[PDB]
Amino acid sequence: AILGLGTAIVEIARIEAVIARSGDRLARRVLSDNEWAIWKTHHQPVRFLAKRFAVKEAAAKAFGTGIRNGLAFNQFEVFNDELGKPRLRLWGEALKLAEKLGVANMHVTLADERHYACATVIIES
Amino acid sequence: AILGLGTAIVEIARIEAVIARSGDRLARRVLSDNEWAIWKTHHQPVRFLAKRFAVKEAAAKAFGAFNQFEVFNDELGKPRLRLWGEALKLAEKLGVANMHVTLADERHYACATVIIES
Amino acid sequence: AILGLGTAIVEIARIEAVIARSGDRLARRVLSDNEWAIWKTHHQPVRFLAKRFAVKEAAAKAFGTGIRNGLAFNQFEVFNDELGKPRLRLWGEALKLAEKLGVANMHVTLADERHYACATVIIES
Ligand SMILES: [Cl-]
Ligand SMILES: [Cl-]
Ligand SMILES: [Cl-]
Ligand SMILES: [Cl-]
Ligand SMILES: [Cl-]
Secondary structure, eight states, X not given: OEEEEEEEEEEHHHHHHHHHHHTTHHHHHHOOHHHHXXXXXXXXXXXXXXXHHHHHHHHHHHTTSOSOTTOOGGGEEEEEOTTSOEEEEEOHHHHXXXXXXXXXXXXEEEEXXXXXXXEEEEEEO | OEEEEEEEEEEHHHHHHHHHHHTTHHHHXXXXXXXXXXXXXXXXXXXHHHHHHHXXXXXXHHHOOGGGEEEEEOTTSXXXXXXXXXXXXXXXXXXXXXXXXXXXXXXXXXXXXXXXXX | OEEEEEEEEEEHHHHHHXXXXXXXXXHHHHOOHXXXXXXXXXXXXXXXXXXXXXXXXXXXXXXXXXXXXXXXXXXXXXXXXXXXXXXXXXXXXXXXXXXXXXXXXXXXXXXXOSSEEEEEEEEEO
């Protein structure tokens, strides 16, 4: 059964503007350790960040809570499987919420165009 | 089982142009009574309308009038669907037990996805 | 059970620009024979192609593979049923892979505005 659904659209130029304002501080804030390692050596760091931000926002919506009760963007880790498909890995409070809700499967998709990154997340029992 | 899936993208500027041309007529046509009440006191009514239009369009596609697809938000802010009239009747016929709604926006666009489920 | 999820966003102007520089080449590669016939006489052919790209990219992502192992965008044929709702018809490797994955239901939606087309695909047991 579907336990939740979330979507996000991110203006890549906005992420770019935040980076101009505060350097790597947005990345330090929203990225897990594994994602941070990827960001550091990524070919297009702004685009990577915009995409990960989109998944994290969609995930928070999919859990039906948004960011609250000790949740945080850095607890929603994006990784890719061997074929390139995006996946979610949960940490701390996010992981505890998933276990409480009885989450068995987390479906993630990412898309981008020149100006926008979009993501949709479905969580399932 | 998934009974239906719908998505929508709405250019907020397009909605603004409709409102410039015909006032609050669009809002009168597509909003339910509860949504209308929110529209009247909203700090950003056009954006509220664009987002609700997005959900309604997505809901219509998921089922395969817009004011019969009411958007409300729960205690945590999560968007939800409430059905009226012919929409409610259709849902019972199809055996819809669960309806999942999400919406998002940025400066120029609002987006929504709706999944209906047995 | 959800077997996969895919989404895509297409800037219509980008498709317009590719057509301006290389004509029919983009369309011939990604469209099935049925879609090609429609493209050749469609009243809004660029918009048609952009929407087809959106669905096809979302479908390739929903299968969890992207374009690899003999899969091709021209194998994910979009058609509209007697009611008018968008549907997927699969060919070649895509058809074979769906069977092997145990796909019993495919859910397709698409949307467009003046500048952008988008689509989401869910495959299900
Ligand atoms: Cl800015
Ligand atoms: Cl009402
Ligand atoms: Cl056109
Ligand atoms: Cl169509
Ligand atoms: Cl355009």
